Symmetry: none
Subunit: 97 residues, 8 copies
């Protein structure tokens, strides 16, 4: 007689990772599987056309300093999206000060 | 002439399942095909890199108690995020009509 | 120890009405209180500046045919949007053969 | 040298309340200011045209059993849509066991 | 000397199809490429685990009557959800009618 | 038996207005009732704290050149939110 | 024969302010007009029923440390949300292009 | 304890390009990688089943005039949505600060 709504769990309630675990220490690129977690992508976007180079990181602030790059379709080379850690951000929720 | 808007159907209007049918009783993992139904994944996220371990369930309340595991990029083995015991979340995956 | 997500209820799970109860037949205008239910208004938009004229309806299909009028800010009179009904739609979910 | 994206805070990260504080214990109606927190309202909806009657509540589960009432346009009296609650739900995130 | 905001185009402003072109007339299943247009799928959903069976259609009203089938994870066979007749009857695209 | 989904109508399917009707030409400010149509406002935003000054308009292209202004809370004066500072086409058009 | 879509000016993407201009230095409350810009409020929520107390701020990081207060419906007085010391949240309200 | 919200990089808000760089000048089709940036596609839609033909463009106004083509499931060939000679839509894909 009563409606009881269901729930889908938000991914951020289940997953978190130290920033030092988000990138390959041998290439210094964010692992492919984490690129959709760090970047808000449009529907159907081809992830092979982009990459995130890690320039810096902070264990204390849980931030990454990255260079977002995209594959130029004419030259087939990766070039920066924005024109040094070009973008500095905190990928996951933190509880501190 | 009049405009007649179309519609796209919400997936919850077409699909529902008892909680006991969402997971393999032998491994206690939610079947791969249902993981995107239970978890709101970010756009473009690949479900193959994660799995949901069933810690508890209730037939009476139609709820699941789950813990997330992710595939370690170096070893390719599934590892838990960071509880040691107990579920990370207890939730009712589908709409119910009961009370 | 376990996260139990909350829920906000969608208005369509709680409210439904026969199409003949949505408008005053004496004027053929949708009652003011239902205009934001039938039309997705932009955030902050004032419902008092518009009205919905009922051009047709179907008891069998539970549909309404509507045309929109807006209050001219200089004359304070309602005037039709220029260039039958502008739209024919089923305002609420139905379960029927 | 670095882009640092900003953020707006989600209201659910700042506000929570025990279910017994959501309604007047003498009338059993949800306080007006909390109706938009419990129900996802359409944009520009006139909240004065509805009210939420509390039929049941659970201190243990932090749930409410509600019935929506709407103001009949002709008589200006509150009437139920269609006795027990229409819906039983948990309005806020909980951390239990 | 002036900001001019940009725009992304909504898919419904560019695409429409007669309902009879949405499904294979030999199998009565909606073509794979159109399933995300008819159903709002969760992010990352594996479309290979489902199919949409066409039960009815109307050329006059441009509607489809469909039933969802899902692949049973143990048997790997497609089975209907719970249950004759369609689960839903709807008009997939915007129409302009007299 | 069969579920038949309902619909809420998008406002742009019902409302359009020539750009010359969006503002009071005596003051050159967009009428208060149209500010939420031209600007995407956050939920609960106080519209009394903003105004849109019309700097130019095109009848041919149905575009407005506006200067978005907000009321400084310390004083009570309207100041621009950084010629028109913003040129846009408020409504869908069909042309060639 | 060509569709040209209309557009709205997106307020929150154009508006920016130094954090020190968001609150009254005498009361330490965020000015009423900015509360809907800093907080994503549910549809139809009455902003007059809440206020944001500034506990800390950083000119260097352009962040605010805030605590939310709500108007108790019975007493009509603003009370903190407690379910005592420091801010509930520290956040950067606007995009920054720092050195 | 203070909550410090996390943030994702918003691709669409950072990505901008001159309109002449969005399409192959030899085929007059928008490069495949940009189609999801220009068009809001439904969740799970396969972008390989569509293409955007550039009918016109303006360097001065930074606009594109496009027509959509879709892959016929039976023939595996691209066909227009419908013979029209002009664009279905003329739009400005990115924010501009021009004079």
């Amino acid at each position: 007689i009563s409606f009881k709504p269901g729930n889908q769990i938000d991914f951020n309630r289940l997953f978190t990772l130290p920033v030092t675990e988000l990138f390959d220490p041998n290439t210094m690129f964010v692992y492919d599987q984490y690129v959709p977690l760090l970047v808000n992508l449009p529907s159907g976007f081809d992830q092979a056309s982009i990459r995130l180079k890690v320039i810096s990181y902070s264990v204390e602030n849980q931030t990454l300093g990255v260079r977002l790059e995209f594959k130029d379709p004419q030259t087939q080379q990766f070039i920066p999206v924005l024109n040094g850690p070009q973008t500095v951000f905190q990928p996951f929720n933190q509880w501190a000060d």
